[PDB]
Structure formats: C-alpha cells, structure tokens
Design a protein around this ligand. Structure first.
Ligand SMILES: NC(=O)c1ccc[n+]([C@@H]2O[C@H](COP(=O)([O-])OP(=O)(O)OC[C@H]3O[C@@H](n4cnc5c(N)ncnc54)[C@H](OP(=O)(O)O)[C@@H]3O)[C@@H](O)[C@H]2O)c1
Ligand SMILES: COc1ccc(Cl)cc1C(=O)NCCc1ccc(S(=O)(=O)NC(=O)NC2CCCCC2)cc1
Length: 315
C-alpha cells in the first residue's frame, strides 16, 4: 500500500508520527515505535528537531533483530533543521542523524522548513532581546547539497516540508536541477485541506504528505487552546457513526482517497493499532465532498516570531 515517488522509490501511504513533547520520557519513543511496527506501520517520520532519532533508530534496529522486518521493509524519514540550511552544513547534519539512528541511510530526507535560522548549536538561536535570529540562505543551494546526499546514497529520496507553491517553483525552475523534491510534507486536515496546493503538487508529480492530520497535539506553546478540536467535528463524528469507525479513521481515510500520504502520531498502543484500520473501509464520493466542505484555513501551528520570517510559507 505504497505510492511510487518521482525518483522511482516507493513510500507507504500510511506513516507513523514520532514527535512527543519534551515532558514525555525519551524511552517512550523507542517503545511506541516498536508497537507501531508490530501493528504494521512501515513508514516512520522523525527529524533532528524531535530529539528522538536515537530511540526511533533503536526501535527499528530491535524489530530487525527479532526478525519482524528487514531494513528494506522500513521507510524512514528524517529532516534537516533550519539552522543547517547552509550547503556545507547539510551533509554533516544528515550524517549526524544517521549516526544517532544507527542507520546507514534514510529513505527520505526533508528540508524541514524554508525558514532559515542562524547556524550554531541552538535549535532556537535568540538575540540579546530574546528574538529568534533568522538567517538568509539561498534554498536552491541547500537543495543542491540535498541532491549530493542522494547521490552519496545517504538518502534514497529527498523532498521538502512547509513549502508553499512559490517556494516549490523556485526549486522546480532551478537551472540544472537534478532531482525534483519527491514530496512536500505540510499541515493538512479537513479544517485546512490544502486543495490548491495538492492540485499543484499533483501536476508536478510531487506527493503531498499530511501532518497534524488528526488536528495536531494541541501543545499549549504553539496551538491556540480556543481553536476547534478537529476530532470533535460533528460531520466527522457523524461519518464515524455511519461507517462504524472513529473520527480519526475518517480523517486519515479522507487523505488516502484524495491521494495524500498521511501521518498519524499516537503514543497509545490501542490507537496505534486502530490507525492501521484505515485500510479496512471506504468513504463514498459524497462523504468526501462532505469533508471537503469543512475547510476553514485553520492552521494549528502559530509563532508570530515566524510570521515575520521572509520565508514564512503562509504569505
Ligand atoms: N514537517 C513538519 O513540520 C511537521 C510538523 C508537525 C508534525 N509532523 C509529523 O507529523 C506527525 C503527526 O502530526 P502531529 O504530531 O501534529 O499529531 P497528529 O497525527 O495530528 O495526532 C494528534 C493526536 O491525535 C491523537 N490520536 C492518534 N490516533 C488517534 C485515534 N485513533 N483516535 C483519537 N485520537 C488519536 C494522538 O494522541 P495519543 O498520542 O494520546 O494517541 C495525537 O497526540 C508528527 O509526530 C510528526 O512526525 C511534521
Ligand atoms: C521544540 C519543538 C519540537 C517539535 C515541534 S512540532 O511543531 O510538533 N514539529 C514539527 O515537526 N514542525 C514544526 C512546526 C512547523 C514549522 C516549524 C517546525 C515544535 C517545537
């Protein structure tokens, strides 16, 4: 149950989300990534930002060792963090990811974000007044360094995340482009369905990958607590009753039937195993139109530090 990418590799259409807030002990990511594999997730999504690549890497290593899977059965994504956009920092960033995970290669490596930040050992570099220090980088050059990581076999596929159409076009129109981004991983759910972006992405044979597909984790520090709760949506709850499923499964299935590859995070065994049931049922053309009408341009993520960034994608 894969999609063929534009470089000929295959990505599983259902992916496991590994991010958990810092208050959750790091042992949890190891433990739940094993459960995710046990349930049948094969695509696993992490990043340098998440401070869990060692644990996720270990879960994978463990499931290979006990004979459940082979390395080739797992699709593992990491991401280049915005402090490492300068071309000379790209390969070392990857190699560090790979060393932490104890993998020889990632299946996919992404530019996490078009919003470049000051290089250093901060994830969040801030100045004397506590303001985030942006950097200015020509992402066409970051991308060239991404291309070299593919050629070096360190990343089987390369793509982007949190890019808008104009940012995508910059890469696509780049002179002497060797590799198109296979995908653009973006916030995508019935309250922000990204239909226009999706259609553009389809027209360039770029896969849209949905994150916060279940309405985000509603982390107080980035998400307005007054924002509507996606899984409480009446239309989604009603379709959950119709189909004898859950509103999560409605949200995930939605994405699969519109040709979006969809991530789902859960650190609960029960919901991890529930989420693979997305494959067991089908929404009707009308159910899909019902969900289409829920769009409200609601992005769960906010930092008005990041709205001022010249590369802020929602411009
Ligand atoms: N590229 C990017 O910038 C970016 C940004 C954000 C996220 N991501 C990736 O996308 C993944 C998913 O996004 P997300 O972290 O925003 O979370 P999400 O997939 O939208 O899930 C949000 C919440 O839904 C709950 N949930 C999961 N399955 C459920 C079910 N069957 N029924 C009811 N509730 C359920 C989970 O809680 P429990 O854990 O309690 O089950 C989870 O905290 C991330 O972990 C990360 O890998 C990427
Ligand atoms: C610390 C920390 C860790 C994870 C998250 S997060 O937002 O949960 N994870 C993401 O991957 N992406 C973010 C949000 C979209 C654009 C910028 C990157 C937020 C902050």
């Amino acid at each position: 149950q894969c999609v063929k990418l534009n470089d000929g590799h295959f990505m599983p259409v259902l992916g496991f989300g590994t991010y958990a807030p810092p208050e959750v002990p790091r042992s949890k990511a190891l433990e739940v990534t094993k459960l995710a594999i046990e349930a049948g997730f094969r695509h696993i999504d992490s990043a340098h930002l998440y401070n869990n690549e060692e644990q996720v890497g270990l879960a994978i290593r463990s499931k290979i060792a006990d004979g459940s899977v082979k390395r080739e059965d797992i699709f593992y994504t990491s991401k280049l963090w915005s402090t490492f956009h300068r071309p000379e920092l790209v390969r070392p960033a990857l190699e560090n990811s790979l060393k932490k995970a104890q993998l020889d290669y990632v299946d996919l490596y992404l530019i996490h974000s078009p919003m470049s930040l000051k290089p250093g050992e901060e994830l969040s570099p801030t100045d004397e007044n506590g303001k985030v220090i942006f950097d200015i980088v020509d992402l066409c050059t970051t991308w060239e360094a991404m291309e070299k990581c593919k050629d070096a076999g360190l990343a089987k596929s390369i793509g982007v995340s949190n890019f808008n159409r104009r940012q995508l076009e910059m890469i696509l129109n780049k002179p002497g482009l060797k590799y198109k981004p296979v995908c653009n991983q973006v916030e995508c759910h019935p309250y922000f369905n990204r239909s226009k972006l999706l259609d553009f992405c389809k027209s360039k044979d770029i896969v849209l990958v949905a994150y916060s597909a279940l309405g985000s984790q509603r982390d107080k520090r980035w998400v307005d607590p007054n924002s509507p709760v996606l899984l409480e949506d009446p239309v989604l709850c009603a379709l959950a009753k119709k189909h004898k499923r859950t509103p999560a499964l409605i949200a995930l299935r939605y994405q699969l039937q519109r040709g979006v590859v969809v991530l789902a995070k859960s650190y609960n065994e029960q919901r991890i195993r529930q989420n693979v049931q997305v494959f067991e049922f089908q929404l009707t053309a009308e159910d899909m139109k019902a969900i289409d009408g829920l769009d409200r341009n609601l992005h769960y993520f906010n930092s008005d530090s990041f709205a001022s960034h010249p590369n802020y994608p929602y411009s």
